[PDB]
Amino acid sequence: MQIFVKTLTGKTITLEVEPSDTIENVKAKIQDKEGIPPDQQRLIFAGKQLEDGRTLSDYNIQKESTLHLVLRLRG
Amino acid sequence: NNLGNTCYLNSILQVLYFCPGFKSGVKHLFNIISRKKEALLASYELICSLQSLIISVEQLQASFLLNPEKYTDELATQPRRLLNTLRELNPMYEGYLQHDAQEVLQCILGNIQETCQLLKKEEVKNIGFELVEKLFQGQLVLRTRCLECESLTERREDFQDISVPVQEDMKTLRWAISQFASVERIVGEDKYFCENCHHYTEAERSLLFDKMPEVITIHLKCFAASGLSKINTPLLTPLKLSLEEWSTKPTNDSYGLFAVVMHSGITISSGHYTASVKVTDLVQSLKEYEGKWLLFDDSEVKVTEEKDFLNSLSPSTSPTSTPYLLFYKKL
Amino acid sequence: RKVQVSYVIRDEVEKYNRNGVNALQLDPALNRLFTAGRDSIIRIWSVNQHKQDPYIASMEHHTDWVNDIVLCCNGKTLISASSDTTVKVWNAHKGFCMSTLRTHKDYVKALAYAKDKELVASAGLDRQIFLWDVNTLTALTASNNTVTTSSLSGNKDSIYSLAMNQLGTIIVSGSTEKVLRVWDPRTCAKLMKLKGHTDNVKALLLNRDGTQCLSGSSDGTIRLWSLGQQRCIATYRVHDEGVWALQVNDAFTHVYSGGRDRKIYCTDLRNPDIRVLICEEKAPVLKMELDRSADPPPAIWVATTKSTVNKWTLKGIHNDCTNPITPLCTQPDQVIKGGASIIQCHILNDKRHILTKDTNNNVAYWDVLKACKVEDLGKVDFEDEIKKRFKMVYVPNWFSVDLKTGMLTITLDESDCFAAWVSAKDAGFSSGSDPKLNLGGLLLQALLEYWPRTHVKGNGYFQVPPHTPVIFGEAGGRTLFRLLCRDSGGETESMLLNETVPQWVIDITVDKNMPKFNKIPFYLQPHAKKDRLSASDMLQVRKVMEHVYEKIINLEDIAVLAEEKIELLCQDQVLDPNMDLRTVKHFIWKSGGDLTLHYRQK
Ligand SMILES: COc1ncnc(C2CC2)c1-c1ncc2cnn(Cc3ccc(-c4nc(C(F)(F)F)cn4C(C)C)cc3)c2n1
Ligand SMILES: *NC[C@H](*)CS(C)(=O)=O
Ligand SMILES: [Zn+2]
């Protein structure tokens, strides 16, 4: 299934993923395109942060769903 | 007070104290949980912890107004008990580390929303439960238009915050909301797979607002990959925001800026969070602060004029404390 | 970047269109229609009425949609542009490709022609326009001769249309930039930047002098431009939705317009209130081509998203209404038959068979490994036929399926091609052993068994059909090489395979060494002596039963005592003795973490 990810510049990228894909595999595919390490990445869908160790089916991520990519601003 | 690394939580608690209905909704939920406890969990400790924080704050505001000669130790005001409840709900808040203020806002709002859904399911087993859903929750319409077959597709997705770019790959906040919401062409490596064409095609993509909350939080992406870099230049922040341009229906609603959270630091890995808040509404001197701005350091409250605050925020002067969360309220 | 190996499951002769038609051309001297399909095949058709079968030939060397075709040099040469990023030169009289141009970076959407200069332009999604001399493009191969590139620059967004003046003096580009761009192709210079369209422009026309352009946008407008004044001179709103096809008579006075609304009009450009509805089509109009055998055009050919191409007769175009709703012709005068497109594919649990549903609502059963159809199931329910063919087996995914061409395309990548190990018995082969087979390996050895470099011939278990096209492409749709499975023995194909076959195919196919076995860890705990284990993903539960009976109970046939003495449990379900550890981990293990097994005595 194809999903959109809105990157740091607001630019949208496309990922091809499966409902059984874990959030860590999606963060690896975002590292492969945008070059950001998975430990610095932070995915938001439908106003909830996606937690590492869950599958895209647990969140109801379908075809044409959008993720927002953000980083931690530590303070 | 601070008591070590909690400036990320303090800034969020200070902006939530001045949100339109947050302080009354937390009192309604805490009174329900208190009636539950007298008639007979970790999520309920978050609402007990928030109520105990809010009561401490009204006791300070009263004590400053009528008895300055009291609370000499600042009564030990503590978010640390709330932080212990957030450790029980989320392992990341362990020790005296530094964290993202937006990630704490998401954790607090999500755990209050889960508590609201739990109390709603309990009551239905035998109206004020939609606290987060009225205040911070909105609904988008994500249109995609395949340039080969000109078929529209809609997705309807919820949002608590609007994450916007600060620079291109000076600017105004209208430009950042245009980059979030206006029509984007997806082309080259990121083609749309169109189920009507059975083919990868270019597409136009547009995001429109359909339901707006009473509080709009804009999450400024003050950070870019160059190995990661903080963007120190702000963009121009309007006092009044109108979203009719990216709206599914025309609406004569205007939103007014009432809180900001700033991050002072030259790197993404460390810094100091500060909040500043407009006082629109809640003994004579209490009303005199209206229209002004409160700036919260680690334990100082400084009253500042709206003009001086917006001059210091504008990119015309070196800001030294980058805006990170902007909160706009329905007028 | 990363080379993928693909192949297409098809019949030897794809006589009918298997998807929509993007481009049309006529040869009036030969009475010959060309149809460039989304099935990647350019077909040649006879348009004489006495011909019962219109089919003449098929020209098949693309790997994705053929977006535009140009007939050049008195119908001797055809130029084809595709979503495979290639522009191809063909012999139109014989039907073979005689050159391929790879100078684009993304899909090539539009061609232009200047008849009086033999000059062709190609444009695409890569924002590039290349100009070609057709007499120069008639070179056999890069080794016989290679050619230079003339480029027009200045487009800021993807080009969906070109138009070139017949005299090769003006070229026009229409793009998602919403502004028409004009150059002189002779000097490669800019002339103009016409503004006034509100969406993408898919149709462009020029008159013979290049003085007037006629343009159709997805905004539903047709604009007539005066290129002598850099402005629009008229606008016509006769479509409710986007205009995708335009044609004009030779006098440049009547416009035939069609688009997403499935209607064809003829508007007088001088008096646009007098229009006629020619016909109401069944699908969106993609391209139209006029019959130019008489002064008023007697017919129009209409290509759509459907696999049928229709001729509509234009006789009787004079009534009086400004927007007549009664079409002039309600039945086509000539119909080129089309086939059915595959529109759903479902890979079964063995990772070897597909169920496909087509446009006709027919379900078919396919074998990937042999690259053939097994049976046609008729108009059975697709979700019920999927449920009937459920098997309690797990095989790792090792190929992708694409339906872009309306026929099965199977793709293999290094990442997952080799992840499918299977027993010979489970894969339906036998000899008197149960050897362990890799499906991607056996398929790669069968796909190019005719390569002299791979002989010692084939995998020794199955052969693919000799007509099966084999494609070497990059992730992104850029094709490097295409051949048929039988053609790998030729000198030019053997050299292009030495220059194109990726090393991840050469290691298994040529060096004949075998891929990594996958191993899964598991814990073997007594059900209410503990260790963490690792074994092959395919290990039968019977060999875990043996290992428990011999390592925990070491105090007749030993394997019969092992299976009848020890039981295996996982998630409180007793395991089938014949289940592989893959299938246990995929179905019976819903809990997170490493697979845990428990055991007891019968
Ligand atoms: C964990 O800390 C918090 N968590 C949630 N919220 C809050 C603050 C309530 C936001 C805090 C918080 N942080 C830091 C401090 C420091 N001192 N205090 C008490 C306090 C709060 C507000 C004021 C005050 N209110 C007003 C008026 F706006 F009403 F007019 C004027 N003034 C001033 C200008 C005289 C006076 C004193 C703090 N409280
Ligand atoms: N990033 C945590 C806030 C800074 S401090 C000095 O208040 O701990
Ligand atoms: Zn489409």
- Give me the side-by-side strand order of the main sheet of chain C: 34-35-1-38-39
Cα-atom radius of gyration of chain C? 30 Å
Count of DSSP-assigned helices of chain C: 8
Largest interface: pair, residues per side? A-B, 34 and 56 residues
Oligomer: heterotrimer
Distance between the termini of chain C: 57 Å
User: How many β-strand stretches of chain C?
Assistant: 44
Largest sheet of chain B: 8 strands, mixed
CATH topology of the largest domain in chain B: Cathepsin B, Chain A
Structural class of chain B: alpha+beta
Cα(first) to Cα(last) distance of chain B is 32 Å
Percent of residues in β-strands of chain B: 25-35%
Cα gyration radius of chain B (Å): 22 Å
CATH superfamily of the largest domain in chain B: Cysteine proteinases
The count of β-strands of chain B is 16
Number of helices of chain B: 9
Family (chain B): Belongs to the peptidase C19 family.
Active site (chain B): 7 (nucleophile), 272 (proton acceptor)
Modified residues (Phosphoserine) (chain B): 314
Subcellular location (chain B): Nucleus
Question: What does the model show?
Answer:
The complex is a heterotrimer of chains A (75), B (331) and C (602). Chain A has 75 residues and is of the alpha+beta class. Chain A is built from 1 helix and 5 strands, in the order ββαβββ. Chain A has one helix at 23-34; strands spanning 2-6, 12-16, 41-45, 48-49, 66-71. In chain A, strand 3 (41-45) and strand 4 form a beta hairpin. With 331 residues, chain B is an alpha+beta fold. In chain B, a hairpin with a 4-residue loop joins strand 5 and strand 6 (199-201). In chain B, helix 1 (7-17) crosses helix 5 and helix 2 (22-39) packs across helix 3 (42-66). Chain B is globular. Chain C contains 8 helices and 44 strands. Chain C is elongated, with a radius of gyration of 30 Å. Classes of the chains: A alpha+beta (75), B alpha+beta (331), C mainly beta (602). At the A-B interface, strand 1, strand 2, strand 3, strand 4 and strand 5 of A face helix 5, strand 2, strand 3, helix 7 and strand 9 of B. The complex binds the ligand COc1ncnc(C2CC2)c1-c1ncc2cnn(Cc3ccc(-c4nc(C(F)(F)F)cn4C(C)C)cc3)c2n1, 3-(methanesulfonyl)propan-1-amine and zinc ion. Chain B: This is Ubiquitin carboxyl-terminal hydrolase 1. Chain B: The active site is at 7 (nucleophile), 272 (proton acceptor). Chain B: InterPro entries: Papain-like_cys_pep_sf (IPR038765), Peptidase_C19 (IPR050164), Peptidase_C19_UCH (IPR001394), USP1 (IPR033815), USP_CS (IPR018200), USP_dom (IPR028889). Chain B: It is found in: Nucleus.
